[PDB]
Amino acid sequence: RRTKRERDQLYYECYSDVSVHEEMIADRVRTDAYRLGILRNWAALRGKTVLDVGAGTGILSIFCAQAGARRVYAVEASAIWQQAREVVRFNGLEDRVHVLPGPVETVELPEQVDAIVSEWMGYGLLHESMLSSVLHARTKWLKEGGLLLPASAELFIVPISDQMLEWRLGFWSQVKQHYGVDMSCLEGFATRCLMGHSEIVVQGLSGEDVLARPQRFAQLELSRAGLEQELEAGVGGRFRCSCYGSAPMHGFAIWFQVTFPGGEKPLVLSTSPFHPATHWKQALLYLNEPVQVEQDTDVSGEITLLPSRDNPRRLRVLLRYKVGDQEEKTKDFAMED
Amino acid sequence: RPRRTKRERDQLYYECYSDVSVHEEMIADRVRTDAYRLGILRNWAALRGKTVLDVGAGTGILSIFCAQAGARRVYAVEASAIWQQAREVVRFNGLEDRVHVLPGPVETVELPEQVDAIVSEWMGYGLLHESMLSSVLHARTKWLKEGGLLLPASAELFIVPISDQMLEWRLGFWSQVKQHYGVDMSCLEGFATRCLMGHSEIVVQGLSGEDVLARPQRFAQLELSRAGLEQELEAGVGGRFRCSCYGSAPMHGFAIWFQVTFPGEKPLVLSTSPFHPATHWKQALLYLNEPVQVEQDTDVSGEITLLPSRDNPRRLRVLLRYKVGDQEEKTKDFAME
Ligand SMILES: Nc1ncnc2c1ncn2[C@@H]1O[C@H](CSCC[C@H](N)C(=O)O)[C@@H](O)[C@H]1O
Ligand SMILES: Nc1ncnc2c1ncn2[C@@H]1O[C@H](CSCC[C@H](N)C(=O)O)[C@@H](O)[C@H]1O
Ligand SMILES: *CCC(=O)Nc1cccc(-c2c[nH]cc2CN(C)CCN)c1
């Protein structure tokens, strides 16, 4: 029964709480990437004007002030804007950073800007669907030739064997050795419960969980004309890879990176399991049950990321896949609550 | 609260026990599962050739422990769909003539006879969350023979003031931002305090000795054979407490926890204390709206009541009144997260 005004109310109220901003600012990989991406673009920002789309606690806007921006419009729709105003005033930057309450779509800036900065990425890159707000701002408020930070995003997929899941499935066969009762027969049940659902699971993996070379399946250049329409229809594509070895394959992980223009050279913020952990972790797409793979087992497929039917802020993933000689299968996932 | 009928609430409660994760967590809790295993086997003399009712058999584990103790017949009653898994575990262990899995609530299930003993793991967070105890007492009245065994036989509830070191780290986070990022966010401590302490939810979290500010106090004792215990549960259980603080510390509120006792041999105690080995129950934390500074010998006293919530009688409510030093008496009314 959820309307657009109610959905947006609930979405923004979630960002009014401290925990989510604590988690974001405690993410050093994330927050340093933005700090360093901003400072490397000093030449484009010094004396110039910036729009921070979704300013939160104000931190990115203040990085921009510190890079030399003449003025920063810190726009924020959640009640956290009040915290941002307090932080700006506390750092003595009222004259340089103007906190503006409300959605960026309807906010009134006194001028167009030279640059946009935004941390808009959700789980699986596109959960929350905030990118359309950034693009709306770009069209409405960014000067011709202005700077967009980050400037692009890329999506990757790979087959995985999730070590933690494997222990959880193996648990039931270990009951006998712990307590002298054989519960190995609940393995099928544990599998139905943990793998047989159609939810995207957000969980951090290591490189040892990755079974093949990761494949890029989409590239999003934020300045590309028609990107809004692509997001609505769905982004993605085909992939193919070969497994390294014997492993119980559980499904796929997806992740992203975003890239900032260089000064210097281009800075990449990555959420790969081979790279230092971030609060995004990776987004796991589990098969209904494990499939044993071997060295050189072919894994192919096709994936589309799109907004859900009944909630446009909820990521949906449509997956088609083939593991070795098993027939092609499909699975339709939605982001877990 | 959005209105649900009794039948609907009960259905949602049992459906949550139909999933593997809670049973994995319970069985992985070695402290819990070995307490019952040993509590049952120590009572071999009262169980040899005798009949047992397992109230809320789940995956069937306690019922099988009872059969292993020499029980002649065990009735494994389970209202959640997990009864199907119990039935299969029993068959797989070759115990189908001794352990009989019976589906449905213990309140309406028909046994062929009264029993010599009841075993049940009925304890929720803060002991009484879920309100399962009344079902065990219902089964005692209806099915347990006069002089019959009850496992466990009693429960006790404890309270102590705490300085949560983890919470103190989270509140101090905003003062550490300048060091990492060159942006001063120390002014958000107040906001973080309102968010993390100002709510009225019971927070379930594992503490240790370093978090405890005084000698723990027992505030209630529940003897399961006591007449009219059912009525006490509905009216609320609890009592007054007092203690004296050990040293200087920001007091954040209180922790409560419980233990239950099995008849011996000597008597086995399953404890959920922060000074004892960790369990899945952790402790239940009752935060004040903001920290209060205490000193050595600061008097902390009050009265605490645990009772069903009004809208959901399976949700634990806690009525607390307390006084720290010469601060005025305060009250706070909590509900389980
Ligand atoms: N259309 C919109 N207009 C304004 N703010 C928005 C928005 N959509 C999302 N937001 C806000 O954008 C923020 C994304 S999280 C990023 C917070 C902050 N920039 C930081 O880096 O720490 C949230 O605070 C959310 O409420
Ligand atoms: N009134 C009732 N009748 C039957 N089962 C009940 C019940 N109230 C709760 N239960 C069940 O009691 C169990 C409590 S959890 C304990 C599970 C199992 N005995 C073990 O020790 O691992 C749950 O499976 C729950 O569904
Ligand atoms: C499933 C119904 C329900 O809400 N149960 C509930 C609520 C909170 C936490 C748990 C839980 C989580 N892990 C294990 C358990 C059960 N545990 C508290 C022991 C119960 N006898 C369950």
From Swiss-Prot, chain A:
**Residues reported to bind S-adenosyl-L-methionine:** 21, 30, 54, 76, 105
GO MF, any single term: protein-arginine N-methyltransferase activity
- Record keywords: Ribonucleoprotein included? no
* PROSITE patterns linked to this entry: SAM_MT_PRMT
What is the reported tissue distribution? Highly expressed in kidney and testis.
Chief subcellular location equals nucleus
Q: What InterPro entries has UniProt attached to this entry? A: Arg_MeTrfase (IPR025799), Methyltransf_25 (IPR041698), PRMT_dom (IPR055135), SAM-dependent_MTases_sf (IPR029063)
Which domain of life does the UniProt lineage start with? Eukaryota
Which reactions are catalysed by this chain? L-arginyl-[protein] + 2 S-adenosyl-L-methionine = N(omega),N(omega)-dimethyl-L-arginyl-[protein] + 2 S-adenosyl-L-homocysteine + 2 H(+)
GO biological process per UniProt: base-excision repair; cellular senescence; chromatin remodeling; methylation; negative regulation of DNA-templated transcription; negative regulation of transcription by RNA polymerase II; negative regulation of ubiquitin-dependent protein catabolic process; protein modification process
Task: Establish whether keyword RNA-binding is in the entry.
Answer: no
The enzyme class is transferase
Q: Where is the SAM-dependent MTase PRMT-type domain?
A: 8-336
Recorded family membership: Belongs to the class I-like SAM-binding methyltransferase superfamily. Protein arginine N-methyltransferase family. PRMT6 subfamily.
Question: What is the protein's given name?
Answer: Protein arginine N-methyltransferase 6
The source organism is Homo sapiens (Human)
Q: What is the lineage of its organism?
A: Eukaryota, Metazoa, Chordata, Craniata, Vertebrata
Q: Which gene encodes it?
A: PRMT6
From Swiss-Prot, chain B:
Instruction: Spell out the post-translational modification annotation for this entry.
Output: Automethylation enhances its stability and antiretroviral activity.
Give every SAM-dependent MTase PRMT-type domain span: 10-337
Q: Where is the active site?
A: 121, 130
Determine the domain of life of the protein's source: Eukaryota
Q: Which UniProt keywords apply?
A: Chromatin regulator, DNA damage, DNA repair, Host-virus interaction, Methylation, Methyltransferase, Nucleus, Phosphoprotein, Repressor, S-adenosyl-L-methionine, Transcription, Transcription regulation, Transferase
Q: Which residues carry this modification: Asymmetric dimethylarginine?
A: 1, 3
Q: Give its E.C. classification number.
A: 2.1.1.319
Choose one Gene Ontology CC annotation of this protein and give it.
nucleoplasm
Q: Which CDD domains match?
A: AdoMet_MTases (cd02440)
Tell where it localizes.
Nucleus
Provide a Gene Ontology MF annotation, just one: protein-arginine omega-N asymmetric methyltransferase activity
**Does Transcription regulation show up as a keyword for this record?**
yes
Q: What class of enzyme is it?
A: transferase
Q: Which GO terms are recorded in the biological process aspect for this UniProt protein?
A: base-excision repair; cellular senescence; chromatin remodeling; methylation; negative regulation of DNA-templated transcription; negative regulation of transcription by RNA polymerase II; negative regulation of ubiquitin-dependent protein catabolic process; protein modification process
Quote the Gene3D superfamilies the UniProt record gives.
Hnrnp arginine n-methyltransferase1, Vaccinia Virus protein VP39
* Residues the entry annotates as binding S-adenosyl-L-methionine: 23, 32, 56, 78, 107
- Transmembrane segments in this chain: where? none
Tissues in which the UniProt entry reports expression: Highly expressed in kidney and testis.
The protein's matches in Pfam families, at most eight in alphabetical order, are given as: Methyltransf_25, PRMT_C
Q: Name the reaction it catalyses.
A: L-arginyl-[protein] + 2 S-adenosyl-L-methionine = N(omega),N(omega)-dimethyl-L-arginyl-[protein] + 2 S-adenosyl-L-homocysteine + 2 H(+)
What outcome follows a substitution of residue 1 to A?
A: Inhibits automethylation but does not affect methylation of other proteins. Reduces protein stability
Complex formation? Interacts with EPB41L3 and NCOA1. (Microbial infection) Interacts with (and methylates) HIV-1 Tat, Rev and Nucleocapsid protein p7 (NC).
Q: Briefly, what is this protein's role?
A: Arginine methyltransferase that can catalyze the formation of both omega-N monomethylarginine (MMA) and asymmetrical dimethylarginine (aDMA), with a strong preference for the formation of aDMA. Preferentially methylates arginyl residues present in a glycine and arginine-rich domain and displays preference for monomethylated substrates. Specifically mediates the asymmetric dimethylation of histone H3 'Arg-2' to form H3R2me2a. H3R2me2a represents a specific tag for epigenetic transcriptional repression and is mutually exclusive with methylation on histone H3 'Lys-4' (H3K4me2 and H3K4me3).
Name of protein: Protein arginine N-methyltransferase 6
Q: Which organism is it from?
A: Homo sapiens (Human)
